[PDB]
Ligand binder design. Structure first.
Ligand SMILES: [Mg+2]
Ligand SMILES: [Mg+2]
Lengths: 59, 212, 115, 54, 91, 60
RNA sequence: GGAACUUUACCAGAUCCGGACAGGAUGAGGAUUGACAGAUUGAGUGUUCUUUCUCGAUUCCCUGAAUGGUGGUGCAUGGCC
């Protein structure tokens, strides 16, 4: 038919999302010490890619 | 039963065609550049042209020793009949077969496609070549494939004389996302002895001589 | 029993060893195996000693060692790790040899051994 | 049981023959007892020695 | 045939493969392989030589390259040192 | 309609194939056999025949 | 691409592993291979069930994997046309 969506299909993708849970991951420092952690990695530990990702299916 | 002379030119061509494929697969990172085999009584010669003669030869000839007996066990030669040699290409910049295998490794080591291809053409054109043309085709940028060509100098393409003057070789680069094919065409400059290039000039160059 | 250890790893080098119930029982009927060893202790089939029949009837030499499990730990018939020791040991009770030799087999002709 | 390749043991057919380069048994050139596949020959005509003159 | 390789064949193929260093075997799965220790008497089927070498390469002991219809297998530095232990030879 | 079994080889329980009586062996006799060989097909040395209703068995 | 079988990709069945190599439990006091006669079967096909001998560590049983495909997508590509 002309329309392929319905009100009955509401929340289709969010229901069938496989429901992964977050992992443990101990807390980062907060406040002034988190700015210390930002500064030491992007400056003291030497384009600059802030989030370089490992190679995937694009190459 | 003996074969006819028509039946022996066939099996001598399929000999060279199979010998060429084996060494193209083996000696790709040794900078392989061709074979000439000379047959006579008491011995069959095979001369291998390469760019890396310390590597196609082993530490004591170990690599060519294994590479000898691979040809011996396949084609059923006897002991003493088959001897192999390695000669090096004198220029390395006029051999299109060597340069395309290096350009294969410049991409497989995750360098940029255009930086790699101009590194060939700078090296080929400084080595006395009259012209060069590198074509990289495949998924260069993303999901959909492109084609780029990179050019410098002369290039004869329409004649049947381009078999004499233009050296060509095409290989495949097996990326993580797909397959890229690279081509390298080099127009041979000179070398009237036939070291690299024909003796005679180009078919349309007239070059009137000056009087005494 | 320690001189028996050296003579059988020279036997697994060539060629040629028969181990167990076995066709070793078949080659002693043929009397082809030159020398054998087996268990001295009693095990399954009450240590039936048909090998003690089939050796001496075929004029074949015979040697008894007490430990029938861990009989040939040198020969490596048991699982390896390969970091640590061997695991739980299988039978390997009777071993027939037709092999070399040439190092301590001259010492194996001591004690007026069956001839 | 070793009925295993009993039809491929007898070698009379189009399945007994094969491209010597390219392992295929479809459209092979058997002229001059060459036994190369159609497509795998044009890649290898220059090394066998064939050049297209006309 | 069968990839079930008998023990007198496996050490006989390994005796050739340590001596010459290389084995070239056609991909024909109904044909034999012939090697030589002076007597040229192996007549091993090609099905079994593929199985022996596919077990070796999975244990990363050999280097395999494949031409038109022939395999070409070569021993490594670890592979020669491994092959000497199976045949029990002096270095 | 029903799946077959994919037969494994049966274990003989501490005897593949067997000899005869009087295991004392007091220097008088070799032990007798319990089947025959019928040799040169093909080996005949340690080839021992089956009973199979006392018929025969390899081959030889 | 003039296919009787093969080719072969399709349909009704039947075998075989060509599931390497690891890790774990059976294992030489046997891991397992193969098969004569019958029954099974389209099959004087040991495929399997009965029968018992052969093979002698190659295997097999679990777990993780890997290699094969004339499977898909030519609108992911190389190459050739
Ligand atoms: Mg040399
Ligand atoms: Mg003909």
């Amino acid at each position: 038919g002309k329309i392929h969506g319905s009100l009955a299909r509401a929340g289709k993708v969010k229901n069938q999302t496989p429901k992964v849970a977050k992992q443990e991951k101990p807390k980062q420092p907060r406040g002034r010490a988190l700015k210390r952690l930002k500064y030491t990695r992007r400056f003291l530990s030497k384009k600059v890619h802030m989030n370089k990702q490992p190679p995937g299916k694009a190459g | 039963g003996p074969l006819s002379k028509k039946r022996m030119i066939i099996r001598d061509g399929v000999f060279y065609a199979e010998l060429f494929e084996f060494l193209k697969r083996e000696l790709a990172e040794e900078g392989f550049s061709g074979v000439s085999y000379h047959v006579t009584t008491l011995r069959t010669e095979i001369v291998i042209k390469a760019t890396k003669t310390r590597e196609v030869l082993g530490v004591n000839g170990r690599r060519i020793r294994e590479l000898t007996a691979c040809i011996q066990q396949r084609f059923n030669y006897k002991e003493g009949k088959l001897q192999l040699y390695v000669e090096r290409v004198e220029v390395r910049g006029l051999s299109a077969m060597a340069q395309v295998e290096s350009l294969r490794f410049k991409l497989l080591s995750n360098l940029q496609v255009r930086r790699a291809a101009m590194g060939i053409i700078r090296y080929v054109m400084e080595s006395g070549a009259k012209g060069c043309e590198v074509t990289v085709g495949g998924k260069i940028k993303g999901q959909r494939a492109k084609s780029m060509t990179f050019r410098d100098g002369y290039m004869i393409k329409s004649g049947t004389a381009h078999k004499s003057f233009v050296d060509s070789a095409c290989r495949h680069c097996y990326m993580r996302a797909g397959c890229i094919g690279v081509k390298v065409k080099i127009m041979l400059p000179g070398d009237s002895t036939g070291r690299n290039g024909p003796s005679e000039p180009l078919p349309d160059v007239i070059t009137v001589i000056e009087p005494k | 029993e320690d001189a028996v250890r050296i003579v059988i790893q020279k036997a697994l080098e060539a060629n040629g060893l028969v181990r167990g119930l076995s066709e070793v029982a078949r080659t002693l009927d043929c009397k082809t195996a030159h020398m054998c060893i087996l268990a001295d202790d009693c095990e399954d089939e009450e240590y039936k000693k048909l090998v003690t029949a089939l050796a001496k009837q075929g004029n074949i030499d015979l040697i008894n060692v007490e430990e029938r499990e861990k009989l040939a730990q040198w020969a490596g018939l048991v699982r390896r790790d390969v970091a640590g020791e061997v695991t739980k040991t299988l039978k390997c009770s009777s071993v027939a040899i037709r092999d070399f030799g040439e190092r301590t087999k001259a010492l194996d002709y001591l004690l007026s051994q069956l001839h | 049981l070793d009925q295993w390749r009993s039809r491929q043991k007898i070698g009379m057919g189009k399945g007994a023959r094969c491209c010597v380069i390219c392992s295929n048994q479809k459209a092979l050139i058997r002229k001059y007892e060459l036994n190369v596949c159609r497509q795998c020959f044009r890649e290898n005509a220059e090394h066998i020695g064939f050049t297209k003159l006309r | 045939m069968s990839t079930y390789v008998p023990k007198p064949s496996r050490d006989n193929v390994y005796r050739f493969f340590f001596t010459e260093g290389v084995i070239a075997c056609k991909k024909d799965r109904m044909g034999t392989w012939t090697g030589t220790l002076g007597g040229n008497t192996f007549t091993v089927p090609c099905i079994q030589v593929m199985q022996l070498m596919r077990s070796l390469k999975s244990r990363n002991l050999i280097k395999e390259q494949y031409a038109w219809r022939h395999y070409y297998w070569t021993l490594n530095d670890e592979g020669i040192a491994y092959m000497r232990s199976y045949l029990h030879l002096a270095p | 309609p029903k799946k077959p079994t994919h037969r494994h080889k049966l274990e003989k329980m501490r005897a593949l194939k067997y000899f005869k009586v009087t295991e004392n062996d007091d220097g008088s006799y070799k032990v007798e056999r319990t089947r025959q060989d019928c040799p040169h097909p093909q080996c005949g040395a340690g080839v021992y025949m089956a009973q199979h209703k006392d018929r025969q068995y390899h081959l030889t």
